[PDB]
Amino acid sequence: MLNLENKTYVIMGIANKRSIAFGVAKVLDQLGAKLVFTYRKERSRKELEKLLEQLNQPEAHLYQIDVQSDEEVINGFEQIGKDVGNIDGVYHSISSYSLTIVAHEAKKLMPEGGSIVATTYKASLEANVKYLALDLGPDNIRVNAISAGPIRLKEIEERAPLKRNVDQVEVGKTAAYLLSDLSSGVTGENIHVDSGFHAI
Amino acid sequence: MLNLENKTYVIMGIANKRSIAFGVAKVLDQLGAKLVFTYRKERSRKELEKLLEQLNQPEAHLYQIDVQSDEEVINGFEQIGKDVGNIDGVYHSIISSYSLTIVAHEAKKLMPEGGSIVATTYKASLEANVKYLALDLGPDNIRVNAISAGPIRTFNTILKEIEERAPLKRNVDQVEVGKTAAYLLSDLSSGVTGENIHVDSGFHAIK
Amino acid sequence: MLNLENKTYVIMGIANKRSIAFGVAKVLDQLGAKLVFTYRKERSRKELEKLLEQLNQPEAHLYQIDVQSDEEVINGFEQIGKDVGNIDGVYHSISSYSLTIVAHEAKKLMPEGGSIVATTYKASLEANVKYLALDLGPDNIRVNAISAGPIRLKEIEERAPLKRNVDQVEVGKTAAYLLSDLSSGVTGENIHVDSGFHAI
Amino acid sequence: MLNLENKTYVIMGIANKRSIAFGVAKVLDQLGAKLVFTYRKERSRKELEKLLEQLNQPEAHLYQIDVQSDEEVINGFEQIGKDVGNIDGVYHSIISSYSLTIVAHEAKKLMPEGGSIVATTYKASLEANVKYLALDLGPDNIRVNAISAGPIRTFNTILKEIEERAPLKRNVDQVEVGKTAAYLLSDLSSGVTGENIHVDSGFHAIK
């Protein structure tokens, strides 16, 4: 059914056509979701512009955010803030928090609430996903971590129980479980979209 | 538009309008899935083929299954084999990880192209089979993942802590657990196996 | 210097001469520590009796405790309780807690305080070591987990950075860091006496 | 009776009577160990070869070490090489994990039979080198493990939370951190490497 379109998400994290975060765009384009992107380099917008039709229709609300810049992400979101509206949720990508930040700037457009999904892909963990889950919970806000095996290695293929490995687009889809309503009871959580490897 | 309706699943452990598992059928019923039940004491029949006001229309396929004897799990699942014939996964709800294991292996037979199995609870080592059995069937492409429902109505003080200290300041219900489980049997869980999902308002991340 | 003798510990966990928990006895005999043992089977006291000189001198305060028996460990400790005195700390050994229990029965002879050390040796964790650490903390009580690689395999030997693996007696000694005062600031903690393997 | 006095270690980062690291020497001094210092700004000399009222009697061997340039870590440790000559481990106290790394590799040269290295803090990925460097030297038998001191006097509100909500209801000091570190360079830590030890009153296990 459920949980989809018109709703707004800002995939911050795309480097090019193989970025997990294009997976997430891609899937998310597809369910009807309006969608925002941010960007580190001047130019990867060189690319992201091409990156489309694909059906999210302008601009698309590219904004460039470098993410170690308190003050960049700030008129980053303030920028967007005033541009789109407020937002349905965010897709985040040593060692990191920029998320803490990303996230407390993000809070203040999601006023009815939302969701935030951030993707590791040793020895991050996985745990101001918990904290920040504490925090905005009361705000009716969800913070969850997807943590992806590798795409695209050859020990997993043998020891990971699904006898293969993942890609972007299946990471895309756990992402939209996470962004979706299907998951409304859920937070402070981390999903391994890693074929099972994490089991062993 | 999307993912995988059409498909057929055994849900296993509905006692009434309120058994977590029920929400698993409801929601499921709701996505066009096709649905089989099992049921332990069939005064759980007594409700169950009530109404069904579902959209599942046969039949149901209720099956009596006494989850502690191997031989009518063994028979359950063949009977099932003859009737509708063949499957997409199993929502297993309701120590008794034997059920899971032995459930888990015969469900295997119904699945020649693979699938998905979900087991619910409400200590973790559910999480500890979900995970051995996730290796065991993984080579036959079947995922298996646990879910773990925090409490709803079915304790009283423990009821209320979680409203004041679940992040989300409240609690979950059967259709919240139902929704997620749909994510599990689903293809959108496509890459996931031997995982545990707290549908717990947050409460898994504190003190 | 420090942290040693006369102080009383009850190595619950010895099955025979190769039990980690004999390691701990062994080491602990050696620093001057008075020492108590418990036992599952009738008979492993068959063995433990032999298990000695070795210098802890009577009885030694064997008591048999089966550890899924609320009421066994109770006159288990009540038994000892009245026999030795109160105690300096405990050495504990699906999936377990008996420790929770072990531990809240143990509390009430350690009144000035102590320490409790419990040893796992996938997918235990490691975490009512935390809780129970919460609990008795205020009681000036320490709860810590040692988690041992294998003794006595041949993938560790290659991938564990110390290019070998452990034994009992080195597990013995982390144990007496844990039982010792050297560690007085420490609790809710877990030490891998696993050659490094846990790193990788 | 026991473990391994006799031995010789570089302690590296004493600013005064109160620098965590100091307690590392004190305690260490106390077990009969032999002790070398480094010190960044030597108005940290100004205190340091004060008294020493230690039992270390030469000399000390203070060494000026500016922890951000490789070439006088490089020189530090050779100078050290010529003087006392050769070693048992290094207490490294005081981003600047470069220090550790580059410290860590040259300390390697002083150790032909192996040893022990401890690095202190007070985010974790200290824990993340302690651990790469624990692999890297592990084949040369050198362990490396981090410690992580919760706060003492050297913040004010954060001072007091931990007294009310460290399990142990209070806080640690320099000789508590000192004691543990002795456990690290020690042989009683014999099996341990690439680990992190909270000397934190408990505070690592909550909220």
Curated annotation (Swiss-Prot), chains B, D:
Keywords: Fatty acid biosynthesis, Fatty acid metabolism, Lipid biosynthesis, Lipid metabolism, NAD, NADP, Nucleotide-binding, Oxidoreductase. It comes from the Bacteria. It is an enzyme of class 1 (oxidoreductase). The record marks 40-41 as: Critical for cofactor specificity. Its EC number is 1.3.1.39. Pathway: Lipid metabolism; fatty acid biosynthesis. NADP(+) binds at residues 13, 19-20, 40-44, 66-67, 94, 123, 152-154. GO terms for molecular function: enoyl-[acyl-carrier-protein] reductase (NADH) activity; enoyl-[acyl-carrier-protein] reductase (NADPH) activity; identical protein binding; NADP binding. It catalyses: a 2,3-saturated acyl-[ACP] + NADP(+) = a (2E)-enoyl-[ACP] + NADPH + H(+). The active site is at residue 122. GO terms for biological process: fatty acid elongation. Belongs to the short-chain dehydrogenases/reductases (SDR) family. FabI subfamily. Catalyzes the reduction of a carbon-carbon double bond in an enoyl moiety that is covalently linked to an acyl carrier protein (ACP). Involved in the elongation cycle of fatty acid which are used in the lipid metabolism. Homotetramer. This is Enoyl-[acyl-carrier-protein] reductase [NADPH] FabI.
